Paper text:
Kelch-like protein 20 (KLHL20, also known as KLEIP) is a member of the BTB-Kelch family that assembles with CUL3 and RBX1 to form a multi-subunit Cullin-RING E3 ligase (Geyer et al., 2003, Hara et al., 2004, Pintard et al., 2004). The BTB and 3-box domains confer binding to CUL3, whereas the Kelch β-propeller domain serves as the substrate recognition domain (Canning et al., 2013, Lee et al., 2010). KLHL20 is a related CUL3-dependent ubiquitin ligase linked to autophagy, cancer, and Alzheimer's disease that promotes the ubiquitination and degradation of substrates including DAPK1, PML, and ULK1. Here, we investigated the binding of KLHL20 to DAPK1, which was the first reported substrate for this E3 ligase (Lee et al., 2010).
For further co-crystallization trials, we tried an 11-residue DAPK1 peptide (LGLPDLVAKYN) in order to capture interactions of the central “LPDLV” motif, while allowing for local conformational preferences and potential flanking interactions. The structure was refined at 1.1-Å resolution and traced the full KLHL20 Kelch domain from residues 317 to 601. The Kelch domain structure shows a canonical β-propeller fold. The bound DAPK1 peptide shows an extended conformation that packs between Kelch domain blades II and III at its N terminus and blades V and VI at its C terminus. At its center, the peptide adopts a single loose helical turn that is stabilized by intramolecular hydrogen bonds between the carbonyl of Pro1337 and the amides of Val1340 and Ala1341. Here, the peptide inserts deeply into the central cavity of the Kelch domain β propeller where it is anchored in the complex by Leu1339, the second leucine in the “LPDLV” motif. The “LPDLV” motif of DAPK lies at the core of the protein-peptide interface. Here, the hydrophobic side chains pack against Kelch domain blades I and II and make notable van der Waals contacts with KLHL20 Trp326, His373, and Leu592, respectively. By contrast, the second leucine, Leu1339, is the most buried DAPK1 residue in the complex. The final residue in the “LPDLV” motif, DAPK1 Asp1338, is oriented away from the hydrophobic side chains to face Kelch domain blade V, where it forms a salt bridge with KLHL20 Lys498 as well as a hydrogen bond to His499.
Author numbering:
A (entry chain U): 1334 to 1344
B (entry chain A): 317 to 601
Write the structure that this text describes.
């Protein structure tokens, strides 16, 4: 599960 | 004459099913048929004049499906065998008549597995796994070897690099990049492997570097105009082009073309749609 690492926000 | 296709991606909370085609002769981007699925982190390459879209994520789910596009009919077909696991942020390239799927994440883990697609049999087969798990890896093919460059092992972005010998069915670790990079673009240009963009530990990158297999050395290359994580990289009519991405603030539709003589990257307005983590493929028309 989880958002793909490519797209999840960093802020 | 070659044309470039930009496939899928992510923008502002949604994965993308649209596809567009760049014609160098006219410098125009035109929409073509959309994929059956929205796919970000999609692996894209061209095998036997067909454009493949491997895996990705549709905004809701990690995907193990594969579809392919025939430019002659402007149709996508879901007639390709699926991969053995989901493959998101997977590197895809062609070597020896096979399409390789390298690394990625399956939704539960970062992957070191590698499988290859035989278009004659419509079959994927596992080959040797990499030394390292690599989501957001980039790949390139040079001198009969398949290179796996960078990525993330789930904890950190990687500067490490390994290459696959298909005769031996073995991976070998070679010289590392100067910068850790995940979600980077890679392509062969002038018989070196160019690595551009991505994210290191702290930021989206505009930097670039290139690998010469003769010397087993990476050397810095002049930086792009924009920082670009999830950037596509391909050579079209002999020109190296970086496509889309995310700069830290904005999803990008601009593209850049490398000018080795001037030693600079030239920025152009680019695509119809902004695309983080789409894929690119080049078709000879
Ligand atoms: Cl245009
Ligand atoms: Na990812
Ligand atoms: Na779309
Ligand atoms: Na979809
Ligand atoms: Na899922
Ligand atoms: Na699917
Ligand atoms: Na690992
Ligand atoms: Na990471
Ligand atoms: Na070898
Ligand atoms: Na670094
Ligand atoms: Na550290
Ligand atoms: Na370097
Ligand atoms: Na934006
Ligand atoms: Na857009
Ligand atoms: Na291609």
């Amino acid at each position: 599960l989880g958002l793909p690492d490519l797209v999840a926000k960093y802020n | 004459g070659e044309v470039l296709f930009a496939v899928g991606g992510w923008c502002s909370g949604d994965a993308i099913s649209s596809v567009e085609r760049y014609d160098p002769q006219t410098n125009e981007w035109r929409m073509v048929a959309s994929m059956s699925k929205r796919r970000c982190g999609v692996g894209v390459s061209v095998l036997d004049d067909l454009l493949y879209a491997v895996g990705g994520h549709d905004g809701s789910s990690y995907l193990n499906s594969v579809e392919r596009y025939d430019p002659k009919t402007n149709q996508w077909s879901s007639d390709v065998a699926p991969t053995s696991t989901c493959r998101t942020s997977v590197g895809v390239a062609v070597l020896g008549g096979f399409l390789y799927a390298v690394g990625g994440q399956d939704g539960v883990s970062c992957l070191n597995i590698v499988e290859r697609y035989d278009p004659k049999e419509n079959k994927w087969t596992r080959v040797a796994s990499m030394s390292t798990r690599r989501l957001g890896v980039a790949v390139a093919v040079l001198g009969g070897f398949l290179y796996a460059v960078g990525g993330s092992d789930g904890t950190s972005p990687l500067n490490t690099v390994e290459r696959y010998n298909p005769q031996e069915n073995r991976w070998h670790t070679i010289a590392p990049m100067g910068t850790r990079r995940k979600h980077l673009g890679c392509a062969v240009y002038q018989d070196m492997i160019y690595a551009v963009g991505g994210r290191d530990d702290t930021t989206e990158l505009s930097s670039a570097e290139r690998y010469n297999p003769r010397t087993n050395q990476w050397s810095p290359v002049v930086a792009m105009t924009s920082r670009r994580s999830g950037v596509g990289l391909a050579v079209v009519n002999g020109q190296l082009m970086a496509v889309g991405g995310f700069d830290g603030t904005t999803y990008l539709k601009t593209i850049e073309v490398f000018d080795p003589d001037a030693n600079t990257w030239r920025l152009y307005g680019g695509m119809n749609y902004r695309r983080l983590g789409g894929g690119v493929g080049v078709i000879k028309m």
